[PDB]
Paper text:
Among the few candidates, the alcohol dehydrogenase from [name] (ThaADH) stands out with a high activity for the reduction of the cyclic α‐diketone 1,2‐cyclohexanedione to the corresponding α‐hydroxy ketone. The results obtained confirm the previously observed preference of ThaADH for cyclic carbonyl compounds over aromatic and linear aliphatic compounds. This preference is in line with the physiological function of the enzyme, i. e. the oxidation of the cyclic 6‐hydroxycyclohex‐1‐ene‐1‐carboxyl‐CoA within the benzoyl‐CoA metabolism. The overall structural fold of ThaADH was consistent with those of many other MDR−ADHs, i. e. contains the typical C‐terminal coenzyme binding domain and N‐terminal catalytic domain. ThaADH shares with many ADHs of the MDR family the presence of two zinc atoms per monomer.
Residue numbers in the entry:
A (entry chain A), B (entry chain A): 3 to 102, 105 to 355
Write the structure that this text describes.
């Protein structure tokens, strides 16, 4: 009857099942009954890399949540009974930076600032919730649990592609085609680009070959120079621009960043999507010679969640080949498998 | 009677005076009688760093030219007798990249692609010439020779400031306040920013204090952290934004680039204006945390030369405190003095 969460008591300690009572809600809170929560590099950071959470321990992680609003504060009652995706990052929506949001000084994330989605239920602010059309979901052969990874995994690269002005005629180049990079490929394709997938993993390439990558390049097989000349071949074959390439570093490695920076051409955009604390060695002045720009992406404004979901509902992109469902009570095994890079798809924990 | 040039026969060889005959011009060429040619880091690169020129030696350097059109091909005759600034870089204006220019694959520069302005006369294409209102020049206590440095030295940072969307309420921060950086300060001020001048040279700061720098910070005296906190003081004093700072790296050093990258704040723009082949160590992912962008500037579209000159004519910026006039036949002494960093202003060689 009572809900439960699986919490981190300490980084690397076994996750502990903990019942909790909802009680009275504040005016602008809802309870979502969790269908699914994605397992993210950000969660593994808290657990394995002991990254500080803003909420004190113990804390349930998980910030990629779909489910149903089953209880609501008086101001949020219009959410009752509706299928939703919770935004991974909720800007204050009231500060001058939100008025004019991704960097909002008062932005809040589940599984960091408040109790997360590795739970039967999660209490979240109602601001920025994305409704799911349940008819359209069912048609597409998708569970409500499946669209959990629209939060962050789809929306982060959606924001990055939109911000880079990816348009028909363009070559899009994405480095690191697991997780976020996989969706950068699918979305750049949907936006009208001819996409080049670059990864060290042949299986990832094979997969992206079937879902929007017009070209694949194994970065193990091929140094900086062959990389460029292979993409120009692709461009000239299909009558595509040889300038103004839209490059997305999605691996979040120094190796990927060196490799992406290496592929700058005249008027190109380099989108920095993958987070790492690693420093690279680059000559900043390459940006000058190419009259190029480097655009830093942080997450995704909630306002874009409906459009990203729309891509999924309409089969313009595919989630199903990129997700795998596990029991929430196997969170330990899944965390351990994701950390050892044993997972070939994004894990969704399901109560 | 015959014109003459001072040519580089070989990098580091004494410059040699060489008479030449103009002869018949092609349809779209003019002869400018040189009033003045600026002495640029780019010239010193050819001479001291043996950077390859596209024209074979011997070659007269100099690409920052003002003077009078005294002869013209039939298609260019409307230029005859007019005071001009020659663009430092002339895009083809006919390629699809110019149609839609700074990076144009067919772009031409005096003192690199064709004979330069260290000469009594220079034969240039008429495309992109900037007329000078001689009445307005005289009023402002300026020689026609003086506006030679509008080419590159003023226009390069004009392009960079325009491209960064520098607007009232903004804090502009320019690192390296000699030459191009000095004009980035003056132009950001004219555009409505409150400008912070950062340099290692106290005399440069003193100077910029008098010409658009609302604040000066000696980068010798003060590490990364005090730098930020001093600028926030300035911002809060005058009611200015603490985000979306417009940062211009104008020194073209790794030291300056590290220092500028270090000053990224939320929504900031980092303009890369100074060229160097030096590589820096930075975490590219700072661009993400700040939702920031890095914009590479190459030169300036000829179309902006009238607006930049307009700033000079109208006293909105000042050239006079930033120039020093020398005889063209002292090119050797001036090259040697600029290379040893003995010059406190931009040298203009005058026939
Ligand atoms: Zn995530
Ligand atoms: Zn806000
Ligand atoms: Zn120059
Ligand atoms: Zn062109």
């Amino acid at each position: 009857s009572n809900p439960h969460r699986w919490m981190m008591t300490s980084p690397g300690a076994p996750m502990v099942r903990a019942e909790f009572e909802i009680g009275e809600l504040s005016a602008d809170q809802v309870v979502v009954a969790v269908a699914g929560c994605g397992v993210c590099h950000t969660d593994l950071g808290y657990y394995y890399d002991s990254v500080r959470t803003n909420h004190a321990l113990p804390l349930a992680l998980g910030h990629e949540i779909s489910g149903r609003v089953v209880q609501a504060g008086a101001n949020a009652a219009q959410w009752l009974g509706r299928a939703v995706i919770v935004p991974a990052v909720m800007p204050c929506g009231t500060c001058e930076l939100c008025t004019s949001g991704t960097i909002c000084r008062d932005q809040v994330m589940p599984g960091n600032d408040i109790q997360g989605g590795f739970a039967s239920h999660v209490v979240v602010p109602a601001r920025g919730l994305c409704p799911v059309d349940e008819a359209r979901l069912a048609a597409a052969g998708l569970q409500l649990a499946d669209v959990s990874v629209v939060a962050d995994a789809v929306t982060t690269p959606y924001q990055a592609v939109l911000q880079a002005g990816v348009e028909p005629g363009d070559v899009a180049v994405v480095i690191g085609v697991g997780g976020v990079g996989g969706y950068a490929v699918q979305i750049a394709n949907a936006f009208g680009a001819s996409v080049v997938a670059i990864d060290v993993d042949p299986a990832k390439l094979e997969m992206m070959s079937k879902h929007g990558a017009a070209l694949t390049l194994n970065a193990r097989e091929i140094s900086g120079r062959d990389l460029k000349k292979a993409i120009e071949a692709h461009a000239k074959a299909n009558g595509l621009r040889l300038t103004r390439w839209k490059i997305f570093e999605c691996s979040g490695t120094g190796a990927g960043q060196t490799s992406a920076y290496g592929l700058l051409t005249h008027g190109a955009t380099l989108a920095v999507v993958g987070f790492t604390m690693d420093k690279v060695e680059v000559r900043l002045s390459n940006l000058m010679a190419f009259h190029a720009r480097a655009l830093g992406n942080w997450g995704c404004l909630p306002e874009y969640y409906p459009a990203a979901l729309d891509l999924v509902l309409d089969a313009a992109i595919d989630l199903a080949s990129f997700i795998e469902r596990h029991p929430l009570d196997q969170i330990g095994e899944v965390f351990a498998a994701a950390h050892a890079h044993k997972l070939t798809r994004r894990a969704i924990l399901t109560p």
